[PDB]
């Protein structure tokens, strides 16, 4: 129809999705109302300006932003001086999603830099001379796999890496993030991610890990940082993704998990919140929505007959609308929500989430949903490692040619 | 001694007491990537930190230097490790270090390293006497600070300080009944104390929650808590729940109540209830209402549930293909 609005967030009924505070105001409802009011303005902008809406992913702008950042950053990134391998990964993956080639000059320079970040003891640090840590170790490995050259792969010292992982392993099944460091589910994921890709998983490396992770699932259905803590999309993604790598997703109550994550998508905004009663944030477009492809695979592996064969179990269209209309910075790069400033972290995950929302795939079945101009379609991302599915296959195949350290 | 923000602050390369030390420039290689253009102060402090770390100089001046490096980037875990090495090696007064960490957390409460550092201090001293109060102050500024709640659970659990936490939880639920962190803490306290098996406790909690649901019917936290504390034993195990929820339909409806109804129906069909078919249709009707009208953002989920229920509960579900 001519009166019909193709964009879900601009339809008249959508107005009914606004927050109902039952005339009981608290810090929570107040903060939620502020966001929705700001988001409504964005949605209404076309109408009030008397222009026909057009959702365009600003590829050109994002590319310039990334291309430059990969080489040089302002002092605004002093707070990430201990996370440079992450900057490599976030940027390289964003370029990958945007289908932008990685010049071999760049690739080799990235390899050399990550090599300087590698510890003599194993693992990677946040920068040259810094002690190894599981977070930058995970980012370093992902960056090298995105490059996927023989040179990149050879940077990783597999024997030391495994030794490093063992030095962090705890008796209860958990891992420290680094020597004398903290413990939470992130370490399980970082360890399982780098260990599986580089083929260094021994018979006892992850003993008790699946059980420890399962202990982090709480009454909410989601997973917390440590047993007892509130469920959060970041920790839930780490927990499930790690379990998928260990082939132990079944240790979890997948049904309560599914119900929890699907409830994390905001009815009005379209994007996801990180935990119940908090605010929408573009980076959760991945940490949260990324769980659906994982759950789909797990449920299907159990022979679930009710699983859709064309869509993930979340509003794909609404997520794309939120990201495209509310998370792009006009100067390039993406962000948390309107009012927040861009950064490479959100640029990486907003695009990763957009890709997830555009590409559905369950074995032979394949269905895409690209909101806005067709040029918006991105390269697909692997729901476990968050790098190109082809890069995962390529990397794993390569390392399977090597023998698990110590045989 | 000399604060990083002091108007008379001087770069380390201009300090006499550091003249014997040659700074150590960062080794980024020939053609750097993601190279950060550090400010003068930042690079100067870290060039000297790299020097003391390299020499493993365990001195009072190195100790003071870590305070500045941390101030410039509290997320630098390497500096924190060296600081802890210096705390022990130099036999530093840990209560003084406690005063120090209490101040740093106040200014950067969302940082991982600061909280882990405080935990280590408490462990070393074996003194949790200042924790609940300190955490309470942080939570008074951000009632949902994840690190704060996690540290609070650790302290309470390790030192068995359960006695007043439920009271603390009631206070915050009063302030904001929508604080999911407080509902999580409530479940944390009860689980580790009385447990939810004692019928008097479970009864008390469910009454409290339904009462909170009445006051704020659209508050998703109360609903998730209600479901969370009953779903393990099975929702169908509580026959009056369904009826009572249907009574709130009129003046307290929400996609949350409709969703709960579906969960109850789902468990009933799972424990082969009476009127197998009557319950199924009631459920599929709600699943459709939710997917088409009441909760469309979750249409793909609700259609999945509708399908799942149909798949294993329709009158023809157990009937052979030949029939």
């Amino acid at each position: 129809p001519v009166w019909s609005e193709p964009l879900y967030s601009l339809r008249p009924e959508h107005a009914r999705e606004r927050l109902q505070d039952d005339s009981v105001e608290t810090v929570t409802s107040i903060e939620q109302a502020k966001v929705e009011e700001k988001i409504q303005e964005v949605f209404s902008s076309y109408k009030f300006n008397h222009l026909v809406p057009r959702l365009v992913l600003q590829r050109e702008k994002h590319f310039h932003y990334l291309k430059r950042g990969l080489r040089q950053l302002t002092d605004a990134y002093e707070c990430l001086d201990a996370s440079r391998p992450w900057l490599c990964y976030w940027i390289l993956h964003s370029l990958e999603l945007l289908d932008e080639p990685i010049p071999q000059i760049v690739a080799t320079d990235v390899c050399q830099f990550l090599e300087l970040c590698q510890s003599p003891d194993g693992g990677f640090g946040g920068g040259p001379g810094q002690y190894p840590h599981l977070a930058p170790t995970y980012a370093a490995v992902n960056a090298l796999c995105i490059i996927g050259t023989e040179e990149a792969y050879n940077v990783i010292n597999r024997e030391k890496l495994l030794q490093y992982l063992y030095s962090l392993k705890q008796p209860d099944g958990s891992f420290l993030m680094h020597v004398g460091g903290e413990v939470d589910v992130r370490s399980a994921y970082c360890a399982a991610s780098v260990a599986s890709l580089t083929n260094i998983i021994t018979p006892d490396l992850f003993e008790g890990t699946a059980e420890w992770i399962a202990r982090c699932q709480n009454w909410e259905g989601g997973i917390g940082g440590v047993p007892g803590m509130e469920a959060h999309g970041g920790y839930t993604f780490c927990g499930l993704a790690a379990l998928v790598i260990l082939k132990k997703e079944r240790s979890l109550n997948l049904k309560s998990l599914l119900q929890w994550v699907t409830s994390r998508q905001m009815r009005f905004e379209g994007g996801f919140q990180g935990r119940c009663n908090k605010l929408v944030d573009g980076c959760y477009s991945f940490w949260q929505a990324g769980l659906l492809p994982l759950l789909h695979r797990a449920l299907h592996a159990q022979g679930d007959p009710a699983l859709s064969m064309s869509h993930w179990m979340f509003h794909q269209q609404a997520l794309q609308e939120y990201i495209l209309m509310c998370c792009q910075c006009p100067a390039g790069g993406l962000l948390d929500k309107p009012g927040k400033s861009r950064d490479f972290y959100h640029t990486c995950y907003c695009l990763s989430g957009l890709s997830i929302a555009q590409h559905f795939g369950s074995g032979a079945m394949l269905h895409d949903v690209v909101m806005g101009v067709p040029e918006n379609v991105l390269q697909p991302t692997h729901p476990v490692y968050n790098i190109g599915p082809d890069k995962v296959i390529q990397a794993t195949t390569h390392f399977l040619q090597k023998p698990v350290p110590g045989f | 001694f000399l604060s990083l923000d002091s108007p008379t602050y001087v770069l380390y390369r201009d300090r006499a007491e550091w003249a014997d030390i040659d700074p150590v420039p960062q080794n980024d290689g020939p053609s750097p990537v993601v190279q950060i253009i550090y400010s003068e102060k930042f690079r100067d402090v870290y060039d000297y930190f790299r020097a003391v770390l390299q020499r493993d100089e365990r001195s009072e001046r190195a100790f003071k230097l870590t305070r500045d490096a941390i101030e410039l980037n509290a997320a630098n875990y390497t500096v924190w490790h060296f600081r802890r090495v210096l705390l022990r090696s130099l036999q530093k007064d840990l209560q003084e270090e406690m005063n120090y960490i209490i101040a740093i957390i106040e200014e950067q409460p969302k940082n991982y390293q600061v909280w882990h550092h405080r935990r280590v201090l408490v462990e070393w001293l074996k003194d949790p006497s200042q924790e609940l109060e300190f955490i309470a102050d942080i939570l008074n500024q951000d009632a949902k600070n994840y690190h704060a709640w996690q540290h609070r659970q650790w302290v309470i659990q390790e030192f068995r300080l359960w006695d007043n936490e439920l009271q603390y939880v009631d206070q915050l639920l009063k302030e904001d009944v929508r604080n999911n962190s407080v509902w999580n803490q409530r479940h944390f306290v009860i689980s580790n104390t009385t447990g939810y098996s004692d019928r008097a406790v479970l009864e008390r909690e469910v009454q409290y929650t339904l009462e909170m649901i009445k006051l704020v019917p659209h508050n998703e936290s109360a609903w998730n808590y209600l479901k969370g504390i009953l779903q393990d034993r099975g929702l169908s195990r509580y026959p009056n729940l369904l009826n009572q929820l249907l009574d709130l339909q009129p003046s307290h409806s929400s996609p949350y109540l409709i969703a709960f109804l579906v969960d109850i129906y789902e468990d009933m069909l799972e424990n082969q209830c009476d009127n197998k078919e009557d319950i199924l249709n009631k459920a599929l009707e709600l699943c459709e209402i939710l997917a088409k009208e009441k909760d469309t953002i979750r249409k793909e989920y609700w259609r999945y549930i509708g399908r799942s229920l149909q798949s294993k509960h329709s009158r023809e579900s157990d009937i052979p293909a030949s029939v």
């Binding site: 707070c79 996370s83 992450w86 992130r186 948390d336 972290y345 | 997320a75 969302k110 991982y112």
Partner: peptide, 6 residues
């Protein structure tokens, strides 16, 4: 105003 994850 930014997200901290490590």
């Amino acid at each position: 105003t930014k997200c901290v994850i490590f």
